Amino acid sequence: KVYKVGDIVDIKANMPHKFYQGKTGVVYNVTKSSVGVIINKMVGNRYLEKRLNLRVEHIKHSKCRQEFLERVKANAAKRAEAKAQGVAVQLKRQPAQPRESRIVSTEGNVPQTLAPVPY
Amino acid sequence: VLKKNPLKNKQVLLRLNPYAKVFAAEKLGSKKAEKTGTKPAAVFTETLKHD
Amino acid sequence: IIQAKRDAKAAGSYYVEAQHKLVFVVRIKGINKIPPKPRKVLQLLRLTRINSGTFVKVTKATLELLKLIEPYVAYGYPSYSTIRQLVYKRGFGKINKQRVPLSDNAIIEANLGKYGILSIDDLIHEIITVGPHFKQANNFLWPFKLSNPSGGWGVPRKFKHFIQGGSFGNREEFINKLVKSMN
Amino acid sequence: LDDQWLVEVIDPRTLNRAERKRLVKKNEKQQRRNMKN
Amino acid sequence: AHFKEYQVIGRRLPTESVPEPKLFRMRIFASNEVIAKSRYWYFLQKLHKVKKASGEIVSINQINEAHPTKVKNFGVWVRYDSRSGTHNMYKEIRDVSRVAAVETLYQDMAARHRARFRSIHILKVAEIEKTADVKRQYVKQFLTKDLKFPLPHRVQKSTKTFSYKRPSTFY
Amino acid sequence: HRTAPKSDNVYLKLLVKLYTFLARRTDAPFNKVVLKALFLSKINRPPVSVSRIARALKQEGAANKTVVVVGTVTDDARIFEFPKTTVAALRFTAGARAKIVKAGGECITLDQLAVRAPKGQNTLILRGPRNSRE
RNA sequence: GCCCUGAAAAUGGAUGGCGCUCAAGCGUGUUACCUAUACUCUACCGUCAGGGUUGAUAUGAUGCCCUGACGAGUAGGCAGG
RNA sequence: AAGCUCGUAUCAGUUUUAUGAGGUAAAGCGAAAACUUUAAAUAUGUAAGAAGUCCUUGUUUGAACGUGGACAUUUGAAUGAAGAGCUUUUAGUGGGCCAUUUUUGGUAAGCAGAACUGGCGAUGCGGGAUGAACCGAACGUAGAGUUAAGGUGCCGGAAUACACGCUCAUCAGACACCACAAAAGGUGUUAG
RNA sequence: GGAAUACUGCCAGCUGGGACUGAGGACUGCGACGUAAGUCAAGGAUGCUGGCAUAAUGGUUAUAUGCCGCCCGUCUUGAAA
């Protein structure tokens, strides 16, 4: 397991001393024992700078840029289709839309009415 | 120099919406709708009447 | 819409409608003693003062905002008659600044004839049918400055939930009564 | 300190080992001079 | 407020490989349609693990009274979770419609038991058809043949602030 | 972000009133920037050497752009050759005044430049180094 | 659920007082009504902001004209009188 | 406060989306609760493109670095916004109260220690009889109209309104209350 | 079996009563109305008529009534006295 400088890691302590517990920063230092991970932390309304070392079997290499690495390549994948066609790609990520009107049949499904009968 | 509200002062309503003239012509808000005899299915009646 | 309900009942079935894809929100609570987390949100809605009012394209992401500011506002779905008046009586465009009253179509076409929109009713059509240029069409209008309602509020104490006999929350259809009272 | 899992601001934990090795050997240095006199 | 009675149907949302769940339906007394749906999902959490975001309303309808003139005799189950653990309560109301009966009950429960509108489950409101199934005393009171009773001490509401007559109950 | 210059010179305010008439009604990018330099401090109007002009004429195809300086023009004997060009500014020192004319160049006030170039056509603007003094 | 008891002094006294008992109490429902420097509208002042305007003959161009939004405030800081 | 150094498309006390972790236990059901996948909200981090990517195939098959070329704005979620940095300089002010939220330790009882956010100070105005902290409330000058909180027997402006029930007190209650005397007593009543 | 009404919602349906406001000052615009000429409730009020012509309105000044309103300044920020 290799850590380099600039890797983005998250904290998952495999206790009760200190708690960040799921917080994410970047790596600046590597020695054989620990690695140097530096962390933003607000005081007042201003972010500080927390150099910090951690035993390397408590810290995981974070993947959070995963979908973004896909989606730039996905847009270019759709872009290759986009030159091959008279089409708008609609490459934007969209919010979830409110859904449609539709008819539901009570044919195989008689509405089993209920109450706190009790049961 | 002054905002003349529509929905009164009909001249400023006709400053907008030239269609609104014929809206009051064909009277278009007291439009009648025709009736159709479409009774619901009886299951629907039961489930409403059901306790 | 009426016919689909009628046909389903004759066919023994149930017609649901589509979810209402447009809301109208009015700020109720005053300016002071607000936690910062909602008070950031009202500034995103241009709800800078009491009884200001605007529209929201209903998304998932927008819907989470109303769960945040629920004790402070009221909202529902507007009808055509309700939308038409606020464009008419309280509509104000915005030429670079300056809360410009509408008063003629030529102002609108000078701004949104770029987007095809050249009437006043095109804009109204772009609201109630949430269309391709809704964001600019909503952003064009000034936030609506409304008066305190004529008949009053109903409830004696406002700040309980509308379900629980208060004022705030969703009132999906009943927002149409309150806006005309505040027009 | 050498076994716990974070730091809160070159390794620091081996320094804590080093400063005791001063103070352990400071017993050992002060051992000798009283063994002389 | 003067309530209404509501048939409310919900079907929690069909997923892939689960189309068409079983269309649950309750009878809701409430003022308007908004409170009813709000009251609706509330029961659906207590009964089992469905939640409000997980599902949708199929349809909602108002139930009129089938005979809003005929005087009926109503039996009511109410249980409520006070002050310690809950307990049922069965009171009988001679009344006109279903929605008429619940109104006086909420007037009754807020009179004696300090009972909130949230505090109360209406389990079932049943019409007693046959006489001599009515069990309470005071409902049986008004059922005897050819009932007559006086009004004693008839006050008259004055309109203006003075009168000249030493007015008397009339009589 | 200054609107009117601090100096109570009358003659300076004459040029100000002229270019405001130009900058409103000539829609050329030149006339505004010339006006904007007229509100500057003594610090922000640094003196320009005659040699810095001689750098400019060495550029490509620009031996005939009428170089215009808002500030003042100073002399510098470190150069020796000097072109035959057309220069307008506010102030010429006596060294600066003589060396241009003895080269054969012409020395002009800014108002005549406005007459000759209303839209500032075929001109050139220089600025002296602000970061010289600390 | 209400009800009484469920200790508490020492000038004369306080649900704010009067008093009020199918309340002028308590719980609850319904509308109606009263009202702030709050909000809607208009006028006015003032600041800021954005536009326009040497063309003589006539005027102050730092002027004029159009348009808008704003107006709490100690220590303090600036401007105009 | 003075400036030019920006009037760019750059940012945000915000969500969404993916990725996180506390799995708190609630799925649940497996092999005989003992799974190991997985299902929520409770608050929280990180990320969301133009210096953006590929290709060319070199350096020191990968990887870490590179030469060069191609790919524009439906250019890479929502929503709101011309106020981000600079160089200069420089007035005051650095100890304090109240509340909520977690969290740790507590005892006659009060608490104590942290972390966080409000309010107060410097701030009037309507209400709470009166009040630093309670409820409401965006302070130019006036006019009109509508309300907030709170009220509508009489002081006192507003229904001795309507509707159903309950209560009689030899110092009832009109509220500080979801606390203290408080756990009970009573042939007082009412409903179960 | 056939109707009515309640309820809720709409009308670019009609009509009455009240109260407050009258900014602005050649023209231009958007309009509508009319065959047109031209007209208009269309980029902010005009018309008609009376009284008085002075202490009449107004001002100023005493005083009464209603309602509100504590002694300033300094110092500790609160019993903040």
Curated annotation (Swiss-Prot), chain A:
GO biological process: cytoplasmic translation
Cross-link (Glycyl lysine isopeptide (Lys-Gly) (interchain with G-Cter in ubiquitin)): K1
Function: Component of the ribosome, a large ribonucleoprotein complex responsible for the synthesis of proteins in the cell. The small ribosomal subunit (SSU) binds messenger RNAs (mRNAs) and translates the encoded message by selecting cognate aminoacyl-transfer RNA (tRNA) molecules. The large subunit (LSU) contains the ribosomal catalytic site termed the peptidyl transferase center (PTC), which catalyzes the formation of peptide bonds, thereby polymerizing the amino acids delivered by tRNAs into a polypeptide chain.
Misc note: There are 2 genes for eL21 in yeast.
Subunit text: Component of the large ribosomal subunit (LSU). Mature yeast ribosomes consist of a small (40S) and a large (60S) subunit. The 40S small subunit contains 1 molecule of ribosomal RNA (18S rRNA) and 33 different proteins (encoded by 57 genes). The large 60S subunit contains 3 rRNA molecules (25S, 5.8S and 5S rRNA) and 46 different proteins (encoded by 81 genes).
Example of a GO MF term: structural constituent of ribosome
Family classification: Belongs to the eukaryotic ribosomal protein eL21 family.
Cellular component GO terms held in the UniProt record: cytosol; cytosolic large ribosomal subunit
Protein name: Large ribosomal subunit protein eL21A
Subcellular location per the Swiss-Prot or TrEMBL entry: Cytoplasm
UniProtKB/Swiss-Prot annotation, chain B:
Subcellular location as annotated: Cytoplasm; Nucleus
Job of this protein: Component of the ribosome, a large ribonucleoprotein complex responsible for the synthesis of proteins in the cell. The small ribosomal subunit (SSU) binds messenger RNAs (mRNAs) and translates the encoded message by selecting cognate aminoacyl-transfer RNA (tRNA) molecules. The large subunit (LSU) contains the ribosomal catalytic site termed the peptidyl transferase center (PTC), which catalyzes the formation of peptide bonds, thereby polymerizing the amino acids delivered by tRNAs into a polypeptide chain.
Entry text on domains: The eukaryote-specific C-terminal extension harbors a nuclear import signal and delivers the ACL4-uL4/RPL4 complex to the pre-ribosome, triggering uL4 release from ACL4 and incorporation into the 60S ribosomal subunit.
Disulfide bond positions: none
Subunit: Component of the large ribosomal subunit (LSU). Mature yeast ribosomes consist of a small (40S) and a large (60S) subunit. The 40S small subunit contains 1 molecule of ribosomal RNA (18S rRNA) and 33 different proteins (encoded by 57 genes). The large 60S subunit contains 3 rRNA molecules (25S, 5.8S and 5S rRNA) and 46 different proteins (encoded by 81 genes). uL4 is associated with the polypeptide exit tunnel. uL4 interacts with its chaperone ACL4 and the nuclear import receptor KAP104.
Signal peptide (UniProt feature, chain positions): none
Swiss-Prot record, chain D:
Region (Disordered): 20-37
Null mutant phenotype: Depletion causes defects in processing of pre- rRNA and assembly of ribosomal subunits.
Localization, UniProt: Nucleus
Subunit structure: Component of a hexameric 5S RNP precursor complex, composed of 5S RNA, RRS1, RPF2, RPL5, RPL11A/RPL11B and SYO1; this complex acts as a precursor for ribosome assembly.
Its job: Required for ribosome biogenesis.
Family as reported in the entry's similarity comment: Belongs to the RRS1 family.
Protein name stated in the entry: Regulator of ribosome biosynthesis
Source organism of this protein record: Saccharomyces cerevisiae (strain ATCC 204508 / S288c)
First-to-last residue of the parent protein present: 154 to 201 of 203
UniProtKB/Swiss-Prot annotation, chain F:
Any one GO cellular component localisation term in the record: cytosolic large ribosomal subunit
Main location, first listed in the record: cytoplasm
The entry's keywords: Cytoplasm, Isopeptide bond, Methylation, Ribonucleoprotein, Ribosomal protein, Ubl conjugation
One BP term from GO: cytoplasmic translation
Glycyl lysine isopeptide (Lys-Gly) (interchain with G-Cter in ubiquitin) cross-link site: K102
Residues annotated as signal peptide: none
Record has Ribonucleoprotein as a keyword: yes
Modified residues (N6,N6,N6-trimethyllysine): K36
Compartments where located: Cytoplasm
A GO molecular function held by the record: structural constituent of ribosome
Note: There are 2 genes for eL18 in yeast.
Complexes and interactors: Component of the large ribosomal subunit (LSU). Mature yeast ribosomes consist of a small (40S) and a large (60S) subunit. The 40S small subunit contains 1 molecule of ribosomal RNA (18S rRNA) and 33 different proteins (encoded by 57 genes). The large 60S subunit contains 3 rRNA molecules (25S, 5.8S and 5S rRNA) and 46 different proteins (encoded by 81 genes). eL18 interacts with NAP1.
Family: Belongs to the eukaryotic ribosomal protein eL18 family.
Function: Component of the ribosome, a large ribonucleoprotein complex responsible for the synthesis of proteins in the cell. The small ribosomal subunit (SSU) binds messenger RNAs (mRNAs) and translates the encoded message by selecting cognate aminoacyl-transfer RNA (tRNA) molecules. The large subunit (LSU) contains the ribosomal catalytic site termed the peptidyl transferase center (PTC), which catalyzes the formation of peptide bonds, thereby polymerizing the amino acids delivered by tRNAs into a polypeptide chain.
The protein's name in its UniProt record: Large ribosomal subunit protein eL18A
